[PDB]
Design a protein around this ligand. Structure first.
Ligand SMILES: Nc1c(O)cccc1C(=O)O
Ligand SMILES: Nc1c(O)cccc1C(=O)O
Ligand SMILES: [Fe+3]
Ligand SMILES: [Fe+3]
Ligand SMILES: [Fe+3]
Ligand SMILES: [Fe+3]
Lengths: 174, 174
């Protein structure tokens, strides 16, 4: 059958679940236990981390504006998600989704990482730009399974310690 | 780098390439040689066939209206893509995308079928509802590689011949 129910108006939906869009990831997955992972992220989000997805990621800023800090060749950068734009992120490209304006909604779509495929979550230093701390995982919930790490890094000086210059990363408040 | 270039306004795009949306599939792939397959299909389309995708398929009727004939348990049916709706098609569920109103645009997203994974394209009889003709393939272009079969079925009575009641399928004109 139509496991994922039948079709439904997307805007309305966004309008109804406008209140479930909350930090630190601001997510909200549309259909559960699928392969295509259709989440809808709103603002304001608090990300100071860099996701290292091993798969592609697609976005279409349905309503609102936002950006993406990223590493081009090894140089800090920034992609701008101006309302109405779409964009496909190649694999492993490091992304730091910045969603500031409340009432924002972006369609983020990814896949289910196979068993054996891990996503990474890095943190870089402000002064020296060296990798400060990275973690690899067998992702199983881009909604209810991310914050738990953030929470154990923003809480550990040992980790937020730059292995190149020693400057400690701000953490849970950049 | 950003292989798929950087972000861009999606509506504008749709507006520019409004003239490349043509039958019998009406497609138009957004980014080439990727994994996520972002096509944008417009109307009017001429489909009398049933796609048997081995993977999920997602749609968001950006602008316009359209529907999907499908087989529920083995009963002809119909999903309605009213503008603004989204919907995820489970795997193998047989679909017959009907896109009638010119100037229509739907965001259809699928994946790249691995090597060894084939999509099917069936045809059923009007009177007896039995499978009339089916073909399996290692898909490699939901834009420039489909019509070629349609063309060899609509042109072959032998195939359009119901193996249960004998009534010939209309073909290239239902
Ligand atoms: N990049 C993201 C991710 O990996 C999971 C959930 C949300 C995002 C995002 O870009 O907002
Ligand atoms: N179902 C489709 C497919 O398999 C390829 C291209 C377009 C469609 C569609 O639904 O329009
Ligand atoms: Fe990500
Ligand atoms: Fe440093
Ligand atoms: Fe299909
Ligand atoms: Fe028949």
């Amino acid at each position: 059958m139509l496991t994922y129910g039948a079709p439904f108006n997307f805007p309305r939906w966004i309008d109804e679940h406008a209140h479930l869009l909350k930090p630190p990831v601001g997510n909200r997955q549309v259909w559960q236990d699928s392969d295509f992972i259709v989440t809808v992220v709103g603002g304001p989000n608090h990300r100071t981390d860099y996701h290292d997805d091993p798969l592609e990621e697609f976005f279409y800023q349905l309503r609102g504006n936002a950006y993406l800090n990223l590493w081009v060749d090894g140089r800090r950068e920034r992609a701008d998600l101006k309302e109405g734009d779409i964009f496909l992120l190649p694999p492993h490209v490091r992304h730091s989704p910045q969603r500031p304006e409340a009432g924002s909604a972006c369609l983020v779509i990814e896949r289910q990482r196979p068993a054996g495929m891990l996503d990474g979550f890095e943190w870089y230093c402000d002064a020296c730009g060296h990798l400060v701390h990275r973690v690899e995982v067998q992702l199983k919930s881009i909604v209810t399974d991310l914050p738990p790490l953030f929470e154990s890094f923003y809480a550990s000086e040992d980790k937020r310690r730059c292995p190149h210059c020693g400057q400690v990363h701000p953490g849970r408040a950049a």
